[PDB]
């Protein structure tokens, strides 16, 4: 698969929220908003995995800087 790192997530953004936000760019194999091991709160970042590389490429470029919830996010490739 092809993964996109999504940073600067507003605290209220859930895995489902980023899954929903990136759905328009292509088929998604899964998503995950990373959590804090102490509070269980969002760590402020997550990942969205696409089956296709071009879709992911388009999501990274188009979503970078977009407002998602209470914050403008950051996008990039991820392993």
Curated annotation (Swiss-Prot):
Expressed in heart, small intestine, kidney, liver, lung, skeletal muscle, testes, pancreas, and ovary (at protein level). Phosphorylated by FASTK; phosphorylation occurs after FAS ligation in FAS-mediated apoptosis and before DNA fragmentation. It is found in: Nucleus; Cytoplasm; Cytoplasm, Stress granule. Residues 2-79 form the RRM domain. It comes from the Eukaryota. RNA-binding protein involved in the regulation of alternative pre-RNA splicing and mRNA translation by binding to uridine-rich (U-rich) RNA sequences. Binds to U-rich sequences immediately downstream from a 5' splice sites in a uridine-rich small nuclear ribonucleoprotein (U snRNP)-dependent fashion, thereby modulating alternative pre-RNA splicing. Preferably binds to the U-rich IAS1 sequence in a U1 snRNP-dependent manner; this binding is optimal if a 5' splice site is adjacent to IAS1. It is linked to Welander distal myopathy: An autosomal dominant disorder characterized by adult onset of distal muscle weakness predominantly affecting the distal long extensors of the hands, with slow progression to involve all small hand muscles and the lower legs. Skeletal muscle biopsy shows myopathic changes and prominent rimmed vacuoles. Rare homozygous patients showed earlier onset, faster progression, and proximal muscle involvement. Amyotrophic lateral sclerosis 26, with or without frontotemporal dementia: A form of amyotrophic lateral sclerosis, a neurodegenerative disorder affecting upper motor neurons in the brain and lower motor neurons in the brain stem and spinal cord, resulting in fatal paralysis. Sensory abnormalities are absent. The pathologic hallmarks of the disease include pallor of the corticospinal tract due to loss of motor neurons, presence of ubiquitin-positive inclusions within surviving motor neurons, and deposition of pathologic aggregates. Homooligomer; homooligomerization is induced by Zn(2+). Interacts with FASTK; the interactions leads to its phosphorylation. Interacts (via RRM1 and the C-terminal glutamine-rich (Q) sequence) with SNRPC/U1-C (via N-terminus); thereby facilitating spliceosomal U1 snRNP recruitment to 5' splice sites. The RNA recognition motif domains RRM 2 and RRM 3 are necessary and sufficient for binding to uridine-rich target pre-mRNA. This is Cytotoxic granule associated RNA binding protein TIA1. The gene is TIA1. The chain holds residues 105 to 183 of 386 of the full protein.
